[PDB]
């Protein structure tokens, strides 16, 4: 039986414990802010 | 928010529960005394720490009288 | 099967060596000792100071 | 009451008010948005869950959180987080005794100073300007709108005129 | 009253030089005006919205179009004075960068660990 | 250790200068608090119930040192072993 | 420096004759503590400024707290158990200064502290690790209460009798002794 | 301003619908501290001047609740002016419209404590004990 | 100087050769081999490259139509990882030193050495002047019974001389009664069920 | 009295550090409210990344 919901997302280390969560999770944020991965936007508002 | 809630009030007896509050005295409007102490303590630990001498002192019913609150009636067995 | 992948990427001037990485400097108990005295110093001092105003 | 409302026929459940309150959350990206003061629950329990485990670690002696040594002053000092990067442009192969950086807000003048002082080894320093510029916003190809991070210009100036070469 | 000292209310000089929104470094004795408390939620806004008018013709705070973030400020570092613009009154709340080097085998560490 | 139960009020002294200036210092559940030394005895209901208290006390000091305190007691603890 | 191991104290009750404790000192085991104490009692107050001097400082610079154990009381003393002063900055019993700073501390001085015969001298302190200028004879048999907590620099060699002398004054109300025990001069006896 | 096409009153319609902080602060006692109380009806030992610590003073003594304090020791004699403060420490620590939902249905009215307003859930079994205590008496 | 600048930005992008994509980061037990001080060396290594990193995304997000997008992006997620698995191992340590000093700090507190005047506590017992008496009882006896039997005859005051009196069952017979009333339990539950099952045949 | 106080006080500070504020450890509403459909999920994050 599921300890969180289906659409959670999972934020936490590999064993399990919980100490960084606030970093993972800024982490994620600041990049899905500005994925470092992203290439040439296709939009006319562009940041630039 | 509040550190250390205070016990339940007239809960001098081991085995059975303490009499319901505002009739010791504080605010009415309850008719069952409860403690999580009473509670929680496993049955088994409630008995080994009485006598069937004690347990028939504390099992005593005073019926419409109240003790604690002399020459009234006890609030519990009123309707309201 | 296995996962096997792109092994033909490297970057060796800006890359630690796994003999190099894999050194244990971590000696415990000393610095564990510091650490612990250095906290030990701020809640004694900050209990005293409770004593003061009280 | 002059007359009573036929309240009996219905369930009791809380209607909606008419004029219904608006999500707390702030949909504006542009320039002026505010950053809002009022602070609710979750701020407390993130900080709570951050500085130490609120739900199951015991909370350590009140001295050691009010002190420099509590871990999120312990890490500050001795582990320090600062984007402090650097307009290309402006040291590119011009000779530029002002050089740009991009800082974040939260650094005055002289911890600027500092920074580049102590790891950049640069000394000499006349002296900073200092900019707060809104971070970049921008929409995506399916319209959603994204703000990056909000930033502090430091023109730096100099004592000795400044380039990075480009090889062509 | 007002805990936070009354220069950053109405000015240090006659000119209004030390009014606005400041920040204290949660370690450090003296406070600020910045208050999230719902009682203070009207000035604060009162400050990020108008700004102040100063009776000298300047407009303090905010004047433009960008409202300035009263919480990413950098920490209040001390208090003016009219000699010296600004004295620093606590030192210990600049950030002193110190990096540790040419310690052991720290040359030899580079950014990224490498493959197998 | 009594003086320090008694409630004090945070006001202006001038204020306590007007109303004890007019008879309103004792209305509402103010009083004022000056030390005494010796009392009223008659009348004194208070006086009255703990000098009868320090009375018994005195007789039954009497009752120790002639010793019947002892024989009760052992006695108490004869009827309890009896039981 | 080992052969400074004596310092004295000559200590007056009111209007009494001051009369001489000379202590003895265990510089090796507690270098610190022994190194703040010996100072304390000599006290170089020896500069003397000139008029210039005092155009120029415009402070009067022996305004602060002079670093010395002369015209120091004794501050808390009771019966049977020990006796304490040596306040620098007030004679009132609180706020510690020492040679090197506010208060000093030595980890591994504290540690090996015990307290065990009587006419023992060791540092009064709020902390294990807050050390000021204040210092406490034992009187009683044993303390071995105190072995984590405080730090033992020395003994009473002479004037143990100055000691349960200045024991027996009667405490006032307000908690010091009724009648004022003060430290009249000290000296290092080197 | 609330009223507007900008902006800034756009943002003054949505962020300041979000809910403050909130704890009970129950209100201050300035007139009787619990806290001096700690000196009254001892007595004086005359060689020291100190109190006398009496070891009947702590049976007979009446815990004073409160929020920066955990407990304060007070004469019985002198309970009878704390009886608020007795009673918002046994309170629920909410406004009870919060909690209220405890009231109306009435599998929680039977498994939470009601008295004076702290909504608390009573001792409950768990389901395996509810079992097992249900079996061994064979029924 | 200028070299201080020529580390933000980078060495191949600057002599225009393509950027290689390093083996990976410092993973999480490999920093807990590390020290403190090499530790936080690595934070300062990671610190400078994770600046320059910034500052060419920054450039390249720059003139995006002119200069494509940035080449071998993997290497930020890489040192930003690196940099959250050293604050773990921080984190970590730090935790440990809170716990050992706590509990040394209330071993303190229950030794009571601390006093705000500089000095030492009075000693422990002087004050306390009071004597526990330890009975043993086959029977239980109730408490009052208890305090007027042993109560102090000479003594004029309600208590009578006794400040408190406190039952007890030691351990090792409480445990003996819980175990005896489980058999006693399991005891009806099997002479219920020998009377339910051979009351068909009998 | 002194020492008494400050350990109370100690207790106290972290017993109200530990039970304020209170939140719920679960409500069906945060299922209810973190529940999105799908055109908002790629409405939310997507970037160019998925498609190159
Ligand atoms: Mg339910």
Same mark, same amino acid.
């Given at each position: ?48 | ?80 | ?54 | ?168 | ?116 | ?83 | ?190 | ?139 | ?202 | 009295?002194?020492?008494? $106080?400050?350990?109370?006080?100690? @207790? ?15 409500? &069906? $509403?945060?299922?209810?409210?973190? @529940? ?15 498609? &190159?």
């Amino acid at each position: 039986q599921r300890k969180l919901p289906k659409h959670f997302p999972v934020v936490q280390a590999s064993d399990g414990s919980s100490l960084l969560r606030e970093e993972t999770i800024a982490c994620m944020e600041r990049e899905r802010r500005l994925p470092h991965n992203m290439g040439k936007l296709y939009s006319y508002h562009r940041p630039y | 928010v509040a550190p250390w809630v205070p016990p339940p009030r007239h809960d001098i007896k081991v085995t059975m529960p303490p009499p319901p509050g505002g009739e010791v005295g504080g605010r009415f409007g309850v008719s069952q005394g409860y403690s999580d102490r009473l509670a929680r303590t496993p049955y088994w630990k409630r008995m080994a720490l009485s006598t069937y001498k004690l347990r028939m002192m504390e099992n005593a019913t005073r019926y419409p009288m109240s003790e604690h609150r002399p020459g009234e009636y006890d609030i519990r067995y009123l309707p309201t | 099967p296995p996962v096997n992948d792109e092994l033909e990427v490297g970057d060796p001037l800006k890359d630690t060596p796994i003999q190099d990485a894999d050194e244990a400097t971590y000696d415990r108990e000393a610095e564990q000792a510091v650490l612990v005295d250095k906290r030990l110093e701020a809640m004694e001092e900050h209990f005293v100071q409770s004593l003061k105003q009280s | 009451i002059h007359k009573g409302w036929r309240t009996w026929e219905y369930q009791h459940t809380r209607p909606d008010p008419r004029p219904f309150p608006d999500p707390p959350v702030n949909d504006y990206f542009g320039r002026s948005r505010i950053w809002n003061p009022i602070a609710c629950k979750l701020g407390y329990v993130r900080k709570k869950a951050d500085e130490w485990g609120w739900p199951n670690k015991p909370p350590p002696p009140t001295g050691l959180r009010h002190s420099q040594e509590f871990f999120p002053f312990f890490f500050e000092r001795y582990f320090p987080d600062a984007e402090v990067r650097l307009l290309l442009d402006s040291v590119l192969n011009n000779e530029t005794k002002r050089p740009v950086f991009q800082i974040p807000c939260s650094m005055s003048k002289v911890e600027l100073v500092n920074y580049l002082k102590n790891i950049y080894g640069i000394d000499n320093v006349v002296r900073v300007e200092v900019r707060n510029r809104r971070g970049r916003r921008y929409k995506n190809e399916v319209g959603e709108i994204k703000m990056m991070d909000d930033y502090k210009v430091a023109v730096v100036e100099l004592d000795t005129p400044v380039s990075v070469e480009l090889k062509q | 009253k007002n805990s936070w000292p009354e220069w950053m209310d109405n000015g240090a000089d006659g000119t209004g030089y030390g009014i606005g929104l400041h920040r204290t470094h949660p370690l450090s004795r003296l406070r600020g005006n910045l208050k999230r408390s719902p009682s203070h939620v009207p000035r604060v806004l009162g400050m990020m919205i108008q700004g102040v008018w100063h009776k000298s013709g300047v407009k303090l705070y905010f004047r433009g179009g960008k409202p300035p973030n009263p919480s990413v400020h950098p920490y209040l570092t001390g208090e003016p004075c009219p000699l010296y613009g600004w004295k620093v009154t606590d030192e210990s709340v600049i950030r002193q960068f110190n990096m540790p080097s040419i310690d052991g085998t720290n040359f030899r560490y580079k950014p990224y660990v490498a493959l197998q | 250790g009594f003086v320090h139960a008694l409630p004090h009020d945070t006001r202006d002294a001038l204020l306590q200068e007007w109303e004890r200036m007019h008879h309103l210092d004792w209305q509402f559940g103010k009083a004022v608090y000056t030390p005494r030394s010796k009392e009223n005895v008659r009348g004194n209901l208070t006086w009255l119930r703990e000098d009868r208290h320090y009375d018994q006390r005195m007789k039954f000091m009497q009752e120790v040192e002639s010793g019947e305190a002892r024989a009760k007691h052992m006695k108490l603890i004869a009827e309890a072993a009896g039981n | 420096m080992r052969i400074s191991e004596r310092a004295f104290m000559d200590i007056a009750i009111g209007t009494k004759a001051p009369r001489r404790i000379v202590f003895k000192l265990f510089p090796r085991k507690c270098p610190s503590a022994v190194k703040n104490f010996i100072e304390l009692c000599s006290g170089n107050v020896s500069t003397d400024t000139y008029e210039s001097g005092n155009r120029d400082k415009l402070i009067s610079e022996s305004a602060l707290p002079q670093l010395t154990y002369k015209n120091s009381t004794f501050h808390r003393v009771e019966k049977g158990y020990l006796i304490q002063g040596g306040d620098i900055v007030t004679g009132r019993g609180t706020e510690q200064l020492s040679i090197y700073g506010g208060t000093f501390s030595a980890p591994e001085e504290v540690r090996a502290s015990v307290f065990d015969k009587p006419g023992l001298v060791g540092t009064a302190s709020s902390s294990p690790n807050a050390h000021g200028s204040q210092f406490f004879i034992l009187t009683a048999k044993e303390a071995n209460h105190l072995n984590g907590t405080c730090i033992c620099f020395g003994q009473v060699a002479d004037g143990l009798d100055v000691v349960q002398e200045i024991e027996q004054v009667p405490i006032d109300p307000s908690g010091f002794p009724s009648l004022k025990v003060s430290i009249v001069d000290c000296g290092v006896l080197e | 301003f609330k009223q507007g096409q900008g902006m800034f009153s756009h943002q003054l319609k949505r962020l300041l619908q979000k809910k403050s902080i909130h704890r009970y602060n129950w209100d201050p006692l300035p007139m009787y501290d619990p806290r001096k109380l700690v000196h009254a009806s001892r007595h004086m030992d005359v060689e020291t001047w100190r109190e006398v610590p009496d070891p009947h003073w702590d049976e007979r003594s009446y815990l004073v609740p409160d929020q920066m304090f955990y407990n304060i020791p007070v004469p019985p004699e002198y309970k009878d002016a704390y009886w608020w403060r007795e009673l918002q420490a046994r309170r629920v620590q909410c406004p009870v419209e919060w909690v209220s939902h405890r009231m109306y249905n009435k599998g929680d009215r039977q498994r939470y404590d009601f008295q004076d307003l702290a909504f608390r859930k009573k001792f409950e079994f768990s389901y395996e004990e509810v079992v097992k205590n249900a079996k061994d008496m064979r029924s | 100087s200028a070299a201080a600048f020529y580390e933000f930005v980078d060495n191949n992008f600057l002599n225009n050769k393509r950027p290689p994509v390093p083996g990976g980061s410092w993973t999480v037990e490999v920093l807990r081999n590390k020290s403190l001080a090499d530790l936080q060396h690595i934070w300062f290594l990671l610190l400078k490259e994770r600046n320059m990193l910034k500052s060419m995304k920054e450039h390249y997000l720059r003139h995006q139509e002119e200069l494509g997008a940035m080449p071998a992006p993997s290497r930020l997620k890489m040192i930003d990882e690196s940099m959250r698995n050293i604050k773990r191992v921080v984190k970590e340590r730090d935790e440990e030193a809170t716990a050992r000093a706590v509990e040394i700090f209330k071993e303190r507190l229950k030794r009571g050495i601390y006093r705000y005047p500089p000095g030492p506590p009075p000693p422990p017992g002087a004050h306390d002047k009071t004597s526990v008496v330890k009975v043993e009882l086959s029977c239980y006896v109730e408490e009052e019974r208890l305090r007027e039997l042993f109560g102090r005859y000479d003594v004029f005051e309600p208590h009578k001389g006794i400040v408190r009196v406190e039952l007890k069952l030691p351990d090792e017979v409480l445990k003996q009664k819980e175990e005896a009333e489980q058999l006693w339990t399991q005891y009806m539950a099997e002479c219920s069920d020998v009377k339910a099952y051979h009351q068909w045949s009998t | 009295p002194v020492y008494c $106080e400050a350990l109370r006080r100690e @207790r106290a500070r972290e017993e109200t550090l530990m039970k304020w504020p209170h939140v719920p450890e679960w409500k &069906y $509403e945060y299922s209810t409210y973190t @529940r999105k459909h799908l055109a908002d999920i790629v409405q939310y994050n997507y970037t160019n990344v998925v498609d &190159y």
